[PDB]
Amino acid sequence: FSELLDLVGGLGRFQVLQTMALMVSIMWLCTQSMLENFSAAVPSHRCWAPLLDNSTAVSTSLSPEALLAISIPPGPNQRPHQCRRFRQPQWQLLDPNATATSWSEADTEPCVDGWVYDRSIFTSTIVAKWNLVCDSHALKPMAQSIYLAGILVGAAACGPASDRFGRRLVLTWSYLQMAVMGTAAAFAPAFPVYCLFRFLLAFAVAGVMMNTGTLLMEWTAARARPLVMTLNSLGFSFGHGLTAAVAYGVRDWTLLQLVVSVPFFLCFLYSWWLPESARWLIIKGKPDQALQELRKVARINGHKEAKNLTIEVLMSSVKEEVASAKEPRSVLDLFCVPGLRFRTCISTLCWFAFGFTFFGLALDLQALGSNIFLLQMFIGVVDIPAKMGALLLLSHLGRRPTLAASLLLAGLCILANTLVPHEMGALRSALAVLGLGGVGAAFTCITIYSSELFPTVLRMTAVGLGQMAARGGAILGPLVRLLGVHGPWLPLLVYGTVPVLSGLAALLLPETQSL
Ligand SMILES: *[C@@H]1O[C@H](CO)[C@@H](O)[C@H](O)[C@H]1NC(C)=O
């Protein structure tokens, strides 16, 4: 089949343009996934109070800070209580002689009149719009979990649909669905509706993710395939800096969601100029259309040998690919074959740890440091060198030590975050960034390692099981943030322990580097 592509041009103008387009689309998709750091940022809040907020009331000479002392009780975090207010104004606290014994918990009431939010950084967020605070604090991580479950279901549906209808058609409708559901979510009137539309948007995101990579492989000669996979991975790295810049420019959540959704109407449009995969068309029994597509691409590449191709050449040569359908395998087959039991268990655990840790940490940057725009930028800045150095080490020192060291380093960097003093926000930010870079390198290492652990027919099923395990773990990722009620150290402790244990499992895998 590669010789046909060399009769069409296995790496030329067409592949360059296609790669550029799909890289850009992946950048915007990454912005879609990371958006809720800025769309659902939690501004500081307090109950609405008659004295503080009703400017129409009788004015007084007291300073704003004195009124804040008079109205809102002190909270655990050495700050105003974010969910309670005094039943009656506590004038007695105004004198410096006041003591905590002067007021009882019975003298505080939960916010009846709602909350007042800080607008200095963000003009509006879904948290401020729908009051996802206090009793409703669980609703933000629940929304993120619903988005990731949408990704899981979309990935499940993409395979059968992609085989029945083709890569390009599914990619086109995935683009359209992403644009429509991102625009619908921006104007949602209520929180449940917002969750529904985010779920369907993730449903489309999964199809874009899968079909972009699949369709890039099948039009590229084998001598350039790994480079294309690397560039596809780097598009995600650039998506973080894109998110940082766009969110820095746009401080309003509706406009931000709209801005990151509009680009996919253009992606939908240029998807119509993309040719469908020739392998799929021939295997489906459509040689004429496949020949049309191949002559199309050869014309794009300015390649003369379009004169030579005929349907007889296509059918006779690719017949061996058409014959490939004869040997299916199940997930149950992986677990039944004695020796693959161990490899499957540990590999699945590593995939699960990657997804769990990355999407647990990356979606609450507001806890990891001071400035979230710079954190979002810097995880993208670190991801690139991390992944390419991971490739260098993986070609030098083998799969097993590199994967183990990457996961262990990520775990140790995240665990240290729980031990460092809070005053050193800079050091904490650096450690968090390094941990996420380590997780990205582990993603690279496992992506390559999985294809080598298993025999050829089971290779694809094993990779599918791993990816599905990662998508399932990402769902549990955000929910662990609910444990933060007992202190922010516990979510980070979980996020840190998991990669450590999965790295210590990586040491037990068998090596595959040829020596
Ligand atoms: C603010 O004070 C005025 C005083 O006349 C009152 O009528 C109004 O209801 C107060 N606002 C709220 C939200 O209670």
Curated annotation (Swiss-Prot):
One of its GO terms (biological process) is response to xenobiotic stimulus. Glycans are attached at N54, N97. Signal peptide: none annotated. Changing R85H: In RHUC1; strongly reduced urate transport. CDD domains: MFS_OAT. Keywords: Cell membrane, Disease variant, Glycoprotein, Ion transport, Membrane, Phosphoprotein, Transmembrane, Transmembrane helix, Transport. It catalyses: urate(out) + (S)-lactate(in) = urate(in) + (S)-lactate(out); nicotinate(in) + urate(out) = nicotinate(out) + urate(in); urate(out) + n chloride(in) = urate(in) + n chloride(out); orotate(out) + nicotinate(in) = orotate(in) + nicotinate(out). This is Solute carrier family 22 member 12. The keyword Chloroplast does not apply. Changing G360R: In RHUC1; reduced urate transport; reduced localization at the plasma membrane.
